Each structure stands twice: as C-alpha cells, then as structure tokens.
Design a protein around this ligand. Sequence first.
Ligand code: HEM
Ligand code: CYN
Length: 180
Amino acid sequence: MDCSTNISPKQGLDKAKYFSGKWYVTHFLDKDPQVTDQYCSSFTPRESDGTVKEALYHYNANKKTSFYNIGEGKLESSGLQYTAKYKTVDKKKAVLKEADEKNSYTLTVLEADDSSALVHICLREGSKDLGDLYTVLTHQKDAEPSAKVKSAVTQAGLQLSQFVGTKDLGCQYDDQFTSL
Ligand code: HEM
Ligand SMILES: [C-]#N
C-alpha cells in the first residue's frame, strides 16, 4: 500500500513547538494494516543543526508487549519533515540492531502548537512502502487535542472520528524510556 501523496510540512511552523516535551499518540489513522493488532505510541523528538534524534516507543495493546527504537535523520529544506533511519533497542537503550540503509520512515509535521500536533509517517523498507499513518499527538497521556489540531485533521481531508482513539486501548507507556 502506497503512502499518501499530498504530504508536505506546514510552512510557518515554529520548530520549538514540535521539538518540545514528549508526544503521546491520542488518535491514529492507518491506511492498510498488515497487522490487526492495535498499538499505542509515545516519542521524544529533539533537533540540533538540522539533525533529528528521537526515542520511539510502541505498545501492542492486544499482546501487551512493548518495543523500542531510536530514529535519526536530517530535516528537509522543505521545513518540518525528515527521513529517519532507526536503531532497534531494548528498554535500556542497548542497541540490538544499528540503523541501516534500507529501513526508514519519513515524518512530516502538518500542525503543531503548544499542546498538540498532527503528523504523518510513511514507513518504508527498500523499494516498498510498508505503512502510512496519521497521528494526533498531545503532550500528556489522554489530553484533549487542540481545536487547531482538529481543524488540521479536517484540512488534511480526513475525519477524526475514523481514527482509532488510543484511550480505549488500555495503553501502557514507559515514561522512563522516553525521558531525555
Ligand atoms: C499509535 C501510533 C502507531 C501505530 C498504530 C503504529 C503501528 C505500527 C506497527 C503495526 C508496526 C509494525 C510492528 C511489527 O509487526 O513489527 C510499526 C512499526 C514501526 N513504527 Fe509505528 N506505529 C505508531 C506510531 C509510530 C510513530 C509515531 C513512529 C515514528 C516517529 C513510528 C515508527 C515506526 C517504526 C520505525 C517501526 C518499525 C519498527 C521495526 O521494524 O522494528 N510508529 N508501527
Ligand atoms: C508506524 N508506522
């Protein structure tokens, strides 16, 4: 399944609002799961001189297992958009696999304000797009997304009610891992 084509970062976005705190996914819209399991996610993005580093957590709400990654990529000349290669780590950040050259994701920020954000993620391996995801983000677990971000969903051509809301999933987070 092809990642979504009309995706570009919102211009005028202040990078300090996006590379701020930690993010929790409150809603996600996944185009074509080759998996039926539903996930929760939290991550902590930081940027310096155009390089983005982010600690990334996923919790499988069906199996009740968690996995961990560290992404690294460069900002585009376009604005708040980056393609990241990623390490696979354990909960203590010990590296299981280094980043490689075939596995990457491209994250594009479509809205970000003081409390909330809307991003798009296209996950790829080699010549294949593996996932396309929109995620609504907030800075605390189950905080309400802002009006601005709900408007950005509607402006992306989407319906917020068609996203999966993560509150109902019994999410568990590892706030230790996403600290720093
Ligand atoms: C609630 C939000 C999310 C959902 C529902 C979701 C869903 C998934 C699923 C189903 C997988 C495949 C797991 C497997 O079977 O190996 C996956 C992997 C992955 N996701 Fe997400 N994801 C979420 C958030 C994010 C975010 C925010 C990012 C990036 C900042 C991200 C980046 C990745 C990466 C890099 C992998 C590959 C991990 C690997 O190959 O081991 N995901 N995600
Ligand atoms: C995750 N995509």
